[PDB]
Amino acid sequence: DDLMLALALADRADELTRVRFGALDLRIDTKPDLTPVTDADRAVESDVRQTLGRDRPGDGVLGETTFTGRQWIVDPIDGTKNFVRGVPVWASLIALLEDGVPSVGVVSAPALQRRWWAARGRGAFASVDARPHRLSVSSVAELHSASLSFSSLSGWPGLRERFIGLTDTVWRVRAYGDFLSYCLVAEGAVDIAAEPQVSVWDLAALDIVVREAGGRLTSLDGVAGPHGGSAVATNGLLHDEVLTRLN
Amino acid sequence: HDDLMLALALADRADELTRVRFGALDLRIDTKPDLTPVTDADRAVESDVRQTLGRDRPGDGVLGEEFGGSTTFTGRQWIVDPIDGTKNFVRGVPVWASLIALLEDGVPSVGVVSAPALQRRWWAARGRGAFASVDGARPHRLSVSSVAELHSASLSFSSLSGWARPGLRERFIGLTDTVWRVRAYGDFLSYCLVAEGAVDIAAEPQVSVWDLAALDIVVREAGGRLTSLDGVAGPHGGSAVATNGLLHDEVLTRLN
Ligand SMILES: [Zn+2]
Ligand SMILES: [Zn+2]
Ligand SMILES: [Zn+2]
Ligand SMILES: [Zn+2]
Numbered sequence: 100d101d102l103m104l105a106l107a108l109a110d111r112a113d114e115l116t117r118v119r120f121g122a123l124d125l126r127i128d129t130k131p132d133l134t135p136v137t138d139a140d141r142a143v144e145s146d147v148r149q150t151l152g153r154d155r156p157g158d159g160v161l162g163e164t165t166f167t168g169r170q171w172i173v174d175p176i177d178g179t180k181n182f183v184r185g186v187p188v189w190a191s192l193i194a195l196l197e198d199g200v201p202s203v204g205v206v207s208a209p210a211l212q213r214r215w216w217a218a219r220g221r222g223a224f225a226s227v228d229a230r231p232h233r234l235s236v237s238s239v240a241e242l243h244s245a246s247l248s249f250s251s252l253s254g255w256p257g258l259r260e261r262f263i264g265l266t267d268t269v270w271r272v273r274a275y276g277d278f279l280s281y282c283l284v285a286e287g288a289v290d291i292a293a294e295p296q297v298s299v300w301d302l303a304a305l306d307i308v309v310r311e312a313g314g315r316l317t318s319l320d321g322v323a324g325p326h327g328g329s330a331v332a333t334n335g336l337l338h339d340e341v342l343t344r345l346n
Numbered sequence: 347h348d349d350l351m352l353a354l355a356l357a358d359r360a361d362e363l364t365r366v367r368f369g370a371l372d373l374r375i376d377t378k379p380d381l382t383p384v385t386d387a388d389r390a391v392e393s394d395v396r397q398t399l400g401r402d403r404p405g406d407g408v409l410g411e412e413f414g415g416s417t418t419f420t421g422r423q424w425i426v427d428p429i430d431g432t433k434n435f436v437r438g439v440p441v442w443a444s445l446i447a448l449l450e451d452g453v454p455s456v457g458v459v460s461a462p463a464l465q466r467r468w469w470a471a472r473g474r475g476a477f478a479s480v481d482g483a484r485p486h487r488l489s490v491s492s493v494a495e496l497h498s499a500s501l502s503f504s505s506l507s508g509w510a511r512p513g514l515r516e517r518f519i520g521l522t523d524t525v526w527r528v529r530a531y532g533d534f535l536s537y538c539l540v541a542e543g544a545v546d547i548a549a550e551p552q553v554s555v556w557d558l559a560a561l562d563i564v565v566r567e568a569g570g571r572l573t574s575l576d577g578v579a580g581p582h583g584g585s586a587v588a589t590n591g592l593l594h595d596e597v598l599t600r601l602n
Contacts, residue, residue: 125491125542125543125544126489126491126492126543127491127492127493127543128491128492128493128494128498129493129495129498130498130526180527181544184500184527184544184545185542185543185544186529186539186544186545187480188529210480211464212465212481227463228465228481237375237376238374238375238376239375239376239377240376240377241377244376244377244378246437250529251522251527251528251529252519252522252523252528253522253523253528263506266505266506266507267506267507270378271433271437271505272505272506272507272530273439273504273505273530273531273532274528274529274530274531275529275530275531276529283439286438287373287375287438288373288437288438288439289437289439
């Protein structure tokens with residue numbers, strides 16, 4: 100019901116973001132100008148607000164501060180720095196919060212031809228370009244067997260040294276970055292995802308997807324959910340050992 | 347008589363076999379993954395490629411990552427890695443690809459990188475440019491970026507662990523602190539993104555000819571440069587740094 104609406108919002112967001120991603124000039128000789136991404140961000144937000152005004156009068160809308168009632172939170176493009184360079188790891192993130200708790204989430208990555216979604220009590224799913232498949236986190240129980248995806252080293256000299264130690268301990272390390280690390284945890288394809296500095300707009304949809312897939316997502320101090328300023332997602336089995344190594 | 351057309355047809359056949367094997371995987375896992383089904387798929391694709399090239403190019407040598415072969419540094423030599431990214435393949439991560447190249451006189455002249463679970467293919471031929479297609483839409487011609495300052499550059503690598511062996515770990519981490527953006531898309535994908543101009547630097551400290559030959563012609567035809575860490579041009583140097591060409595000498599200098 101809210102999930103069906105969230106998936107329809109993602110359909111509309113994808114139509115707008117696809118066109119703007121395709122229209123970019125990717126020739127570049129310096130740091131990229133984020134103006135076309137900001138422009139796309141504004142167009143998606145406007146469309147989302149217009150639809151929710153029609154279909155959910157009296158739901159609040161937050162676009163990338165007080166959490167009350169039913170509130171939709173949208174990050175039209177997560178991975179803006181990828182979007183602007185022509186790297187297709189970017190997605191719209193759409194969540195419904197009830198009293199600040201993600202209850203519906205959609206992660207829509209049109210240039211990866213992929214979507215992930217979840218709703219409380221109804222499981223998590225992914226599609227590639229194409230029937231949905233139900234998601235489940237892995238059963239990897241030992242850190243030395245685990246696969247980890249992060250974003251970069253620079254955001255982490257104590258916590259940096261500890262993070263690098265975790266990367267030396269696990270079986271496999273990659274940095275697919277942003278939302279994609281967390282979505283791969285939910286699919287069971289990766290075991291650990293971590294980012295040291297990340298906002299509620301970037302975590303809300305991922306929180307419900309990971310939880311419905313059987314995993315855990317907490318801040319670095321182990322507090323559940325998307326509000327803690329940092330995010331560690333695991334299959335749940337590895338969670339305590341990861342927080343211990345990082346703390 | 348078109349070697350590029352044959353290479354793209356080998357990729358079509360490889361993709362039909364790898365799609366089936368990727369789709370059939372048991373993804374339940376509770377330890378390090380059992381590579382056996384991936385090793386089997388890897389070997390089956392190589393065998394099929396060898397059988398086709400035996401039929402369509404009977405004098406040509408074929409050097410494969412799974413069955414080996416002699417190298418000729420002078421004749422025509424096909425070099426294939428049927429599945430690059432097998433540790434992704436086995437876990438259900440779709441970053442994996444068949445890499446197919448022809449060398450003439452030691453130099454990659456045709457290359458195809460085929461990633462069916464990313465719905466993507468990259469290819470190039472000497473003098474004829476580099477191209478990519480996404481979900482079999484029309485090809486687009488590739489061009490590396492024009493980023494000239496390291497501090498504005500985007501870098502993609504694989505992992506940190508392989509850097510200690512040549513003694514470069516501290517230097518590599520220093521490069522990651524210098525550039526504008528760091529990711530690790532890993533394997534062939536870092537280099538393909540350099541060719542598209544979406545990333546500026548790709549680096550790996552240990553890479554075989556099978557893993558570099560197709561990437562070498564794609565990067566070159568896109569306007570970039572791919573060398574070993576010690577500056578040897580091409581896929582035979584044992585390590586690989588690919589850039590947009592502008593950043594090349596500064597990257598090699600920072601890494602040593
Ligand atoms: Zn964001
Ligand atoms: Zn982000
Ligand atoms: Zn292989
Ligand atoms: Zn390989």
